[PDB]
Target: Gastrin-releasing peptide receptor,GlgA glycogen synthase
Amino acid sequence: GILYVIPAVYGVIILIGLIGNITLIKIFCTVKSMRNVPNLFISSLALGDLLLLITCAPVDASRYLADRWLFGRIGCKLIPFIQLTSVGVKVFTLTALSADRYKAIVRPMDIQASHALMKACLKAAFIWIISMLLAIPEAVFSDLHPFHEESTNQTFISCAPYPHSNELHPKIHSMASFLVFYVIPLSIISVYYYFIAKNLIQSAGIDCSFWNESYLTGSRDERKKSLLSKFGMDEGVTFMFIGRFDRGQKGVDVLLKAIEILSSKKEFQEMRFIIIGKGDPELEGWARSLEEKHGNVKVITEMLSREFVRELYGSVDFVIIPSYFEPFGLVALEAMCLGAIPIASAVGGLRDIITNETGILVKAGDPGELANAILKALELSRSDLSKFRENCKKRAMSFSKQIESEKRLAKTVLVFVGLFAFCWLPNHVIYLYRSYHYSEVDTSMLHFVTSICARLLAFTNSCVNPFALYLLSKSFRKQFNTQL
Ligand SMILES: COc1ccc(C2(CNC(=O)[C@](C)(Cc3c[nH]c4ccccc34)NC(=O)Nc3ccc([N+](=O)[O-])cc3)CCCCC2)nc1
Model:
């Protein structure tokens, strides 16, 4: 009676997984905008999950209804093989996705993304082949053996992969399964994400929603005059430095040399310099002395809200990044997004981000060179720079979207990993123990609880990955909605 209620829930969840994974694979094949190396691996997963759902459904349906094997040798051997193929694709492809995230963020290459999908198809293909090759033993071991139940003194056909006479081999297979399909892959994923987490950090703060002229009020020219008037300065080309006062990395020294060089000319009076940083006291004083000697220099040695640098970036005409070493270039991307034109050293990220149409590159360590660019900007400033500013905003919002989208992908892959780790550890522990204690019959209620839950947790992982994906990606959700 209430029994005919218990399976219906199983079918509900099985259908949700089948619909979801299928819808996911269909969207990957049908939608060009979503065709990419991460999605190809995710589809690889979705394919592996359907197989598991499909193999397990008759297995589970059968255990609930009858006590005997109803599929025959072919069933007794193909099912373990297909089941185990799934388990490698699942974990190995997750490792491949983790590697993809590492390459995309830690070591962006992509000079010729032409063969990237070509390379990805092969990696997934090989993973399917290796997963099948590792699962070939499951078919050999599993065979039909007559079984006598203590509960009913009756003999039934049984699929049994466990020999009663030989004890050494189960001990070897169990340990290998834990290491090959759990410990080694998760360990590789954790190394990868260690560095991924490392680089996610340099990147923190870059959000298009925040760094935009939408929050600022009034014209840029009007905002600049207000900033200068509060500083007791008249309107002029405004150059900005926001950085720690450190000799080795940021070029506060190079800039201060440059202002010394430019202090002699009649062009200095056309310029205004705001140096916003704190650090070495001697460097801090050189800045203060220049502020006292030159009426066109403002210095700020106090900490400030990203809100107030946002306003400054919009108000200022140019931002100087004289970094002897800048790996990411966050300051330039945030500034260019608000219209500030970067005058930076051609080092690390700055070089890739700043093109000729989007700013001025100088050689680092040359104060004279920096000064000359400052003079160039001065001349450029005479003409309209509105077009350059729009180009800047656009280049920087283009990168900030990829930076943001790839950070989301890293979190989504890690979500997937987490569910897997949690849902598959119990199955591994039960499999190992059983390997040494199969000859003994365990009827303890704890054993049934330990097993009935593991099987449902693993089955849950197969259905949740699409639904999971449905909540972490705005883009996937909209296309999934369209199909339904
Ligand atoms: C929910 O589906 C699961 C749940 C758990 C697993 C395990 C354990 N299940 C099995 O390994 C099955 C898939 C269990 C199984 C074996 N035959 C089956 C037929 C139909 C359904 C399931 C099975 N095969 C197996 O036990 N083979 C085996 C047993 C003993 C020895 N040995 O070391 O003597 C060597 C190999 C645990 C994680 C790592 C390996 C896969 N696999 C699939």
About this structure: The domain at 213-399 is CATH 3.40.50.2000 (Rossmann fold). DSSP finds 15 helices and eight strands in the chain. The pocket of 8B8 is lined by residues 56, 59, 76, 79-80, 83-84, 87, 138, 141-142, 159, 161-163, 169-170, 173-174, 177, 181, 427-428, 431, 435, 455, 458 (CB under 6 Å).
